[PDB]
């Protein structure tokens, strides 16, 4: 394809990827609010830390989309599921991360076909981080499924701090 058609096709999967990230951000932070309300601090904190990874992903995708002359989407892909119990949170997030890695592998392929090496390397790096999320969610989900109350009693009342407050303007 010509130069502008190669960018357009790459901007298209980047925006699909970014919409997935926007969904994950709202989805994982929703679960974080429940986990915190439930006073399972270690889980709440790690959920928030993974949501911040997705925020970074959404930001990196947008930055690349700008580099290529496109408009970064503001709409999330799909609907957020609320009110999930603990076992369902981890079941669903594992599936979600597994779906993301499959989709991004496909997007990576489109970048390689459009001769866009910089964008493909971006997906490569972010897919490796999605793998660390997936592994995390699969491990928690297994402990809940297999060990029940003794596992959660260990998490009950743990600290939920994710560190010093975010840099902001005020």
**Residues in 58-117 that interact with ligand FEC by CB under 6 A:** 58-59, 62, 74
Binding segment for ligand FEC (CB under 6 A), chosen from 49-57, 63-71, 109-117, 135-143, is 49-57
Residue 93 near Fe ion by CB under 5 A: no
Question: In angstroms, rounded to a whole number, what is the distance separating the alpha carbons of residues 158 and 124?
Answer: 35
Q: Which does 104 bind (CB under 5 to 8 A by kind): a copy of itself, ligand FEC, Fe ion, none?
A: a copy of itself
Measured distance CA(23)–CA(14) in Å, rounded:
14
Name which of 72, 61, 129, 75 is nearest 97 in CA terms.
129
- Using CB atoms within 10 A of its CB, is residue 50 exposed (0-12), middle (13-18) or buried (19+)? buried
Pick the binder of ligand FEC from 52, 68, 88, 127 (CB under 6 A): 52
Among the listed residues 26, 38, 70, 158, the single contact to ligand FEC using CB under 6 A: 26
Q: How many helices (H) and strands (E) does the chain have?
A: 4, 0
Contacted entry of ligand FEC, a copy of itself, Fe ion, none for residue 37, CB cut-off 5 to 8 Å set by kind: a copy of itself
By CB under 6 A, residue 16 contacts ligand FEC: no
Q: What angle do CA 128, 132, 135 make, to 5 degrees?
A: 130
DSSP-assigned letter for residue 163: S
CB of 13 vs a copy of itself, minimal distance in Å: 14
Binding site for ligand FEC (CB under 6 A): 22, 25-26, 29, 52, 55-56, 58-59, 62, 74, 162, 165-167
């Amino acid at each position: 394809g010509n130069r502008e058609d190669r960018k357009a096709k790459v901007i298209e999967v980047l925006n699909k990827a970014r919409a997935m990230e926007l969904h994950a951000i709202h989805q994982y932070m929703n679960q974080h609010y429940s986990l915190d309300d439930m006073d399972y601090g270690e889980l709440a904190a790690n959920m928030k830390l993974i949501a911040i990874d997705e925020m970074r992903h959404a930001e990196n995708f947008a930055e690349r989309i700008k580099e290529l002359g496109g408009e970064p989407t503001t709409q999330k892909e799909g609907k957020v599921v609320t009110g999930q119990a603990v076992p369902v949170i981890y079941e669903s997030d594992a599936d979600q991360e597994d779906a993301t890695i499959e989709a991004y592998s496909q997007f990576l392929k489109v970048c390689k076909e459009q001769g866009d090496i910089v964008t493909a390397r971006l997906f490569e790096r972010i897919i490796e981080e999605e793998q660390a999320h997936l592994t995390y969610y699969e491990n928690i989900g297994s402990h809940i499924k297999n060990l029940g109350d003794t596992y959660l009693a260990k998490i009950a009342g743990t600290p939920s701090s994710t560190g010093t407050a975010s840099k902001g303007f005020v």
